[PDB]
Amino acid sequence: PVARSWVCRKTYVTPRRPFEKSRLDQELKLIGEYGLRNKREVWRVKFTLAKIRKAARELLTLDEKDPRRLFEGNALLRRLVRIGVLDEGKMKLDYILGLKIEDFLERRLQTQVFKLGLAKSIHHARVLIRQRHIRVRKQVVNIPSFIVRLDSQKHIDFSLRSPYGGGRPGRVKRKNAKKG
Amino acid sequence: GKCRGLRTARKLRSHRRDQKWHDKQYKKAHLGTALKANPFGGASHAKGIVLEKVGVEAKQPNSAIRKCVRVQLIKNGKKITAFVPNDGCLNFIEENDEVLVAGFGRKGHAVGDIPGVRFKVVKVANVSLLALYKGKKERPR
Amino acid sequence: MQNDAGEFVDLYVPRKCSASNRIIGAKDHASIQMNVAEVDKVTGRFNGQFKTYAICGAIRRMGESDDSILRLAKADGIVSKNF
Amino acid sequence: ELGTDPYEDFQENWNTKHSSGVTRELMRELNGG
Amino acid sequence: EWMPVTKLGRLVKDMKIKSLEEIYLFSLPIKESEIIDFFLGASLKDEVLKIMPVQKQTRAGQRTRFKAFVAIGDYNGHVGLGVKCSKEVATAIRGAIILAKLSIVPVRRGYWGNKIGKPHTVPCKVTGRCGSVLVRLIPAPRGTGIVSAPVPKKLLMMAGIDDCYTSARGCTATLGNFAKATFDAISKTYSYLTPDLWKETVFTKSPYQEFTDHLVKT
Amino acid sequence: MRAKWRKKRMRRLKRKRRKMRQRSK
RNA sequence: CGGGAAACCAAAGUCUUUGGGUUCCGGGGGGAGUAUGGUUGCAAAGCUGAAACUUAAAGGAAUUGACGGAAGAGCGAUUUUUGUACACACCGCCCGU
RNA sequence: CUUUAAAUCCUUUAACGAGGAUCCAUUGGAGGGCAAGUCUGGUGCCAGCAGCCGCGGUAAUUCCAGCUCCAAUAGCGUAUAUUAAAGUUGCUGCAGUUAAAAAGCUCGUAGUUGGAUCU
Numbered sequence: 001p002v003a004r005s006w007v008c009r010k011t012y013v014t015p016r017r018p019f020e021k022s023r024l025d026q027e028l029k030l031i032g033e034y035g036l037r038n039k040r041e042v043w044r045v046k047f048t049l050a051k052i053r054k055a056a057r058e059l060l061t062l063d064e065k066d067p068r069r070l071f072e073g074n075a076l077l078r079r080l081v082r083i084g085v086l087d088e089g090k091m092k093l094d095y096i097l098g099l100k101i102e103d104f105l106e107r108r109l110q111t112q113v114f115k116l117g118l119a120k121s122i123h124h125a126r127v128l129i130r131q132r133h134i135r136v137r138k139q140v141v142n143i144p145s146f147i148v149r150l151d152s153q154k155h156i157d158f159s160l161r162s163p164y165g166g167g168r169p170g171r172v173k174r175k176n177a178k179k180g
Numbered sequence: 181g182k183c184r185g186l187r188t189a190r191k192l193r194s195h196r197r198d199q200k201w202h203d204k205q206y207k208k209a210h211l212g213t214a215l216k217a218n219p220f221g222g223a224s225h226a227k228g229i230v231l232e233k234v235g236v237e238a239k240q241p242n243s244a245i246r247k248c249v250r251v252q253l254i255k256n257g258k259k260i261t262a263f264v265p266n267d268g269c270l271n272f273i274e275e276n277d278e279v280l281v282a283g284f285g286r287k288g289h290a291v292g293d294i295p296g297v298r299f300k301v302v303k304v305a306n307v308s309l310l311a312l313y314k315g316k317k318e319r320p321r
Numbered sequence: 322m323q324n325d326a327g328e329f330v331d332l333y334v335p336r337k338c339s340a341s342n343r344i345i346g347a348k349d350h351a352s353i354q355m356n357v358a359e360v361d362k363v364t365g366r367f368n369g370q371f372k373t374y375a376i377c378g379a380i381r382r383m384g385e386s387d388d389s390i391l392r393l394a395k396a397d398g399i400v401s402k403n404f
Numbered sequence: 405e406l407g408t409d410p411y412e413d414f415q416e417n418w419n420t421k422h423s424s425g426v427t428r429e430l431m432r433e434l435n436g437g
Numbered sequence: 438e439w440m441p442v443t444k445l446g447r448l449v450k451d452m453k454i455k456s457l458e459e460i461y462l463f464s465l466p467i468k469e470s471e472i473i474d475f476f477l478g479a480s481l482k483d484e485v486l487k488i489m490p491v492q493k494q495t496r497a498g499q500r501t502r503f504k505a506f507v508a509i510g511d512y513n514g515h516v517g518l519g520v521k522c523s524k525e526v527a528t529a530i531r532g533a534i535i536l537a538k539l540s541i542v543p544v545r546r547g548y549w550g551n552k553i554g555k556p557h558t559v560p561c562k563v564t565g566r567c568g569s570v571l572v573r574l575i576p577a578p579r580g581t582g583i584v585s586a587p588v589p590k591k592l593l594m595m596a597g598i599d600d601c602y603t604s605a606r607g608c609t610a611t612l613g614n615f616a617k618a619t620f621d622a623i624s625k626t627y628s629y630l631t632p633d634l635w636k637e638t639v640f641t642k643s644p645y646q647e648f649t650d651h652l653v654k655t
Numbered sequence: 656m657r658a659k660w661r662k663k664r665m666r667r668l669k670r671k672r673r674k675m676r677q678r679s680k
Numbered sequence: 681c682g683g684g685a686a687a688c689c690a691a692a693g694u695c696u697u698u699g700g701g702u703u704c705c706g707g708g709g710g711g712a713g714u715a716u717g718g719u720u721g722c723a724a725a726g727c728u729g730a731a732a733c734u735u736a737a738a739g740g741a742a743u744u745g746a747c748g749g750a751a752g753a754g755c756g757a758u759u760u761u762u763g764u765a766c767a768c769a770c771c772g773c774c775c776g777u
Numbered sequence: 778c779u780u781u782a783a784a785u786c787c788u789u790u791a792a793c794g795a796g797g798a799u800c801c802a803u804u805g806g807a808g809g810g811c812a813a814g815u816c817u818g819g820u821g822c823c824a825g826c827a828g829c830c831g832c833g834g835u836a837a838u839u840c841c842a843g844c845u846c847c848a849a850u851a852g853c854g855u856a857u858a859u860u861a862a863a864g865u866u867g868c869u870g871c872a873g874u875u876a877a878a879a880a881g882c883u884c885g886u887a888g889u890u891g892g893a894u895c896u
């Protein structure tokens with residue numbers, strides 16, 4: 001006996017057909033448009049959307065007055081509205097089935113850094129985030145897959161220690177200044 | 181027709197249990213004769229000592245001489261013909277050497293032209309045949 | 322037919338057989354749409370009004386379109402009651 | 405320059421060794437994929 | 438230039454029939470390919486499903502002909518399938534395209550649960566048969582997509598179905614029978630009597646009867 | 656070989672075995 | 681009428697629109713209805729009944745040809761009589777020592 | 778410095794640290810199934826590939842190589858047990874005229890199943 005925990009799970013599922021032309025084209029379009037590293041990042045979001053759809057479909061088979069349906073669909077809709085994929089006017093349980101993977105892809109920190117003008121490319125946004133130049137309202141975040149909540153949207157900035165956010169110049173500038 | 185009574189559970193279960201024995205794979209997996217006859221004894225791989233080198237004629241309409249080795253397993257002492265797959269890899273094997281052998285891919289069934297051969301050589305003298313073929317490792321000597 | 326808002330959502334509404342109430346499909350080429358003229362009770366000439374019947378091909382293949390047309394015409398008063 | 409005609413290649417080699425290839429070309433000519 | 442040879446073609450060319458649903462209502466056979474071009478027009482897209490060589494044994498040797506399978510549709514409720522055999526591949530493809538757009542049927546689309554927005558799936562479970570091949574279509578929830586084999590999926594997409602579950606039995610390696618069975622299953626969607634079609638039918642003037650005076654002139 | 660004569664040959668071989676493979680032996 | 685791969689079947693129908701009751705019984709082709717055990721019989725044999733091993737097909741219905749010491753409609757190939765296990769087409773295929 | 782029983786690791790921080798940024802990404806494939814070259818040089822039913830169909834007997838889209846091109850990616854091949862695919866064990870839900878198949882026929886115990894009717 002030990003005092004350790006063994007709880008873990010996978011975050012993606014591989015497609016059944018390895019070489020399907022349409023699927024390859026769609027996934028490559030998604031990767032190119034959102035600057036993703038590989039196919040696994042598409043499959044992760046697809047798995048998340050599949051789980052949400054499965055929960056919603058299981059809640060749609062109960063009676064409308066069922067206490068568990070009222071309690072859990074409300075929480076699911078509240079979370080979806082909180083992360084920004086859903087809208088306040090569309091908080092019915094049927095609209096969850098109308099969500100697409102691009103809606104979840106639009107809420108990553110990598111795409112929000114690019115959409116807010118802090119970066120001049122999606123790949124530049126990924127590079128900036130991974131190099132500790134971006135902070136979220138107090139905290140330096142270097143995870144591109146960070147999912148931005150609605151109330152945090154206004155609070156993305158350069159870090160105070162960054163050469164871009166008013167900090168000390170970097171290694172290359174100091175060396176070049178020492179040169180001349 | 182099948183019985184659809186409300187109290188026929190015993191009949192249905194007994195009939196299914198008895199008719200499962202007419203499935204080739206179920207009977208092979210649950211009878212025990214195949215496991216007894218299997219030289220590996222249920223293992224994925226085995227180790228043996230190379231008794232000698234042989235050449236097996238490819239079945240028609242193909243014409244070739246497939247290079248194989250007769251080996252004897254260490255755990256049970258059974259004799260086995262294994263295939264050495266690559267262009268010129270038979271020169272990497274010497275007699276009385278120790279080899280690692282795996283299945284050919286069809287679960288005890290012969291593969292391709294080679295008649296009656298269901299095993300292939302993986303490592304010779306504790307080094308993989310792939311590394312010897314690609315020139316990454318040398319024979320220990 | 323229509324959604325929760327009540328708006329009708331269909332390409333078209335197919336017509337049903339007058340004999341058997343079955344739907345007459347778009348590729349049913351053995352179906353018939355026949356008109357029977359109405360006469361004036363005083364003179365007996367063509368009024369200009371007509372009654373329309375539709376028979377599907379399944380009934381026609383059965384040889385039951387004659388009796389069906391006869392019964393439909395009797396029900397509409399075209400054929401005499403003491404037929 | 406017209407070098408390769410998928411229709412002629414299929415109609416000629418449909419029963420030869422290179423059938424499975426030429427068919428694969430002809431589909432690329434037809435469906436655009 | 439198009440010169441129709443039938444009454445229906447003359448009516449369509451003279452702009453007397455508004456939509457193809459008027460023709461579908463009266464189950465009038467379509468014998469001219471230019472009618473479908475006139476109505477559906479640019480929305481039609483076709484795809485070759487298979488080229489199949491068949492052989493007839495003769496005294497001198499085998500005689501080979503090529504059979505083309507072409508599926509067509511506008512992705513918005515209409516679908517057709519055509520099969521044509523010829524000596525040349527291009528001739529067979531042209532004939533198959535003509536035969537496919539001649540036999541174009543409308544598709545009825547329904548809801549799985551709450552009836553909100555536009556229809557997205559089949560109204561109910563529908564089965565089609567061809568040879569030994571049986572194909573079954575089952576309604577699916579919104580956002581599910583088409584869960585089927587590659588061959589039925591193309592026809593289901595061309596018909597305009599977004600979501601559907603599919604089952605199949607029999608020798609589905611026969612591509613022609615596999616396609617014809619799912620085409621039959623799709624065609625059976627408008628022939629199913631649902632409780633919302635129970636209303637008594639109000640008859641209307643047939644195009645032959647309505648425009649007889651114009652037909653007499655031409 | 657005709658199945659009838661194959662069956663007859665099998666029966667004759669079995670009878671020959673039975674004579675050779677005596678129960679007393 | 682409807683079925684079915686078709687030949688055909690008012691049953692071989694009322695089957696993905698799949699549930700009236702119930703008995704026996706099949707699971708790719710060989711090895712093989714063989715070996716062994718049990719049981720019955722005077723005998724011949726009857727009933728029950730494997731495995732190791734081997735193989736990518738064997739088989740059904742129908743079509744066009746070739747052979748013979750014979751006279752708009754079909755899912756689809758396809759559209760003088762007849763038979764075929766032939767299709768490199770009887771100079772064929774194929775069985776046992 | 779912090780961490781800790783004392784350490785290590787992570788986190789925090791000085792100084793050094795990237796142009797071929799040589800601070801070099803691999804594992805399998807390129808006839809079909811199945812994404813991707815009947816390009817060039819060798820070999821010539823040999824050597825070999827090939828899960829299956831097949832390739833190789835002097836112009837090999839398949840072997841041995843060069844180039845190029847595909848797939849997943851710090852991971853990717855192989856052998857074996859097992860699940861889905863298998864409506865090829867079928868309760869849901871399979872078959873039994875000719876493809877494997879209904880006992881030669883009848884009786885009959887156990888088992889299974891059992892016609893209407895009572896506010």
Ligand SMILES: [Mg+2]
Nearest residue numbers: 241242243822
């Ligand atoms: Mg060969």
Ligand SMILES: [Mg+2]
Nearest residue numbers: 608609610611
């Ligand atoms: Mg098959």
Ligand SMILES: [Mg+2]
Nearest residue numbers: 695698870871
């Ligand atoms: Mg049934």
Ligand SMILES: [Mg+2]
Nearest residue numbers: 204707708877
């Ligand atoms: Mg068997």
Ligand SMILES: [Mg+2]
Nearest residue numbers: 204710734735
């Ligand atoms: Mg076997």
Ligand SMILES: [Mg+2]
Nearest residue numbers: 521522752753
């Ligand atoms: Mg014709």
Ligand SMILES: [Mg+2]
Nearest residue numbers: 520753754755
């Ligand atoms: Mg026809």
Ligand SMILES: [Mg+2]
Nearest residue numbers: 750762763764
């Ligand atoms: Mg005869």
Ligand SMILES: [Mg+2]
Nearest residue numbers: 743744745764
């Ligand atoms: Mg014949």
Ligand SMILES: [Mg+2]
Nearest residue numbers: 803804805806
């Ligand atoms: Mg490589």
Ligand SMILES: [Mg+2]
Nearest residue numbers: 807839841842
């Ligand atoms: Mg190469």
Ligand SMILES: [Mg+2]
Nearest residue numbers: 808809810811
């Ligand atoms: Mg391949």
Ligand SMILES: [Mg+2]
Nearest residue numbers: 428811812813
């Ligand atoms: Mg390809």
Ligand SMILES: [Mg+2]
Nearest residue numbers: 240241830831
């Ligand atoms: Mg072979």
Ligand SMILES: [Mg+2]
Nearest residue numbers: 819835836837
């Ligand atoms: Mg050469």
Ligand SMILES: [Mg+2]
Nearest residue numbers: 817818836837
């Ligand atoms: Mg070459």
